[PDB]
């Protein structure tokens, strides 16, 4: 499916008059949630979201929880700062999101790094792929950009990304590689539904697969068909696996010319299947 990855998704929502902003931080290794912090918890701390993370000791959790407190500060402060830059009223709810992390290649070194920020769901500022320059969406962001160029922030982030992000990722991989490097091939099947005069709908189902990376396509006479193919978003079954389907509209009596292709890394060979009556 690709290079290994560690990613953090952090978000803060201001709630004026209802207390502190709500702060949530979620960590993912290979797109699997493994760590989570919520500020509205009874004992706000980082908790494992994966069984292989209970292999970590006491000092780990307390340390990263401290980091969480510092981050809460940062978020509240800069929420207010952005209220400033955008000239907004102080009794509104607003969101500030931070996404960051590392994709590493087969050698174990930094392949790609991420540092991006959104305000009210819209891009604010993002570290370019050079890991040296900033893309600022608008005028309010240019302030932060000049400020951060002046301060040499890009080098700080690049140093974190090339350094400890990768080392942590390596560590985690080493602990959870039994469950992370596992595949569940999809069970595929085709359903048939009347649709209109002379027209039927064929639906290719891929169920119970892990990881979520999958390709479903149709085929008219052995040739790829995606034109007016309806694809739903890959969805969680809730038990760790995923589902997806792809549909086409087909002339009644011609269903035998159509095939569904399922590509998944769990399969030794791609699946090719058709509507099998009765």
């Amino acid at each position: 499916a690709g290079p290994h990855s560690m990613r953090y998704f952090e978000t803060a929502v201001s709630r004026p008059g209802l207390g502190e902003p709500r702060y949530i931080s979620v960590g993912y290794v290979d797109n699997k949630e493994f760590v989570r912090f919520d500020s509205d918890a009874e004992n706000p701390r980082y908790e494992p979201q994966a069984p292989w993370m209970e292999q970590e000791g006491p000092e780990y959790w307390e340390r990263i929880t401290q980091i969480a407190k510092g981050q809460e500060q940062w978020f509240r402060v800069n929420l207010r700062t952005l209220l400033g830059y955008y000239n907004q009223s102080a009794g509104g709810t607003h969101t500030l999101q931070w996404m960051y992390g590392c994709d590493v290649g087969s050698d174990g070194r930094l392949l790609r790094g991420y540092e991006q920020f959104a305000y009210d769901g819209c891009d604010y500022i993002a570290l370019n792929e050079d890991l040296k320059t900033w893309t600022a969406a608008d005028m309010a962001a240019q302030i932060t950009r000049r400020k951060w160029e002046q301060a040499g922030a890009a080098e700080y982030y690049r140093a974190y990304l090339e350094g400890e992000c990768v080392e942590w990722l390596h560590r985690y991989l080493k602990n959870g590689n039994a469950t992370l490097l596992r595949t569940d091939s999809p069970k595929a099947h085709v359903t048939h539904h009347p649709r209109s005069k002379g027209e039927v709908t064929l639906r290719c189902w891929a169920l119970g697969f892990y990881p979520a990376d999958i390709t479903l396509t149709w085929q008219l006479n052995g040739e790829e068909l995606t034109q007016d193919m309806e694809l739903v978003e890959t969805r969680p079954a809730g038990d760790g696996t995923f589902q997806k389907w792809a549909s086409v509209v087909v002339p009644l009596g011609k269903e035998q010319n159509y095939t569904c292709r399922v590509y998944h890394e769990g399969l030794p060979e791609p699946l090719t299947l058709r509507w099998e009556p009765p």
């Binding site: 960590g27 340390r63 990263i64 940062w74 700062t81 931070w98 932060t144 400020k147 992000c165």
Partner: peptide
């Protein structure tokens, strides 16, 4: 492990 923004807006 998560980390700090450190720098302010």
């Amino acid at each position: 492990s998560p980390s700090y923004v450190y720098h302010q807006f």
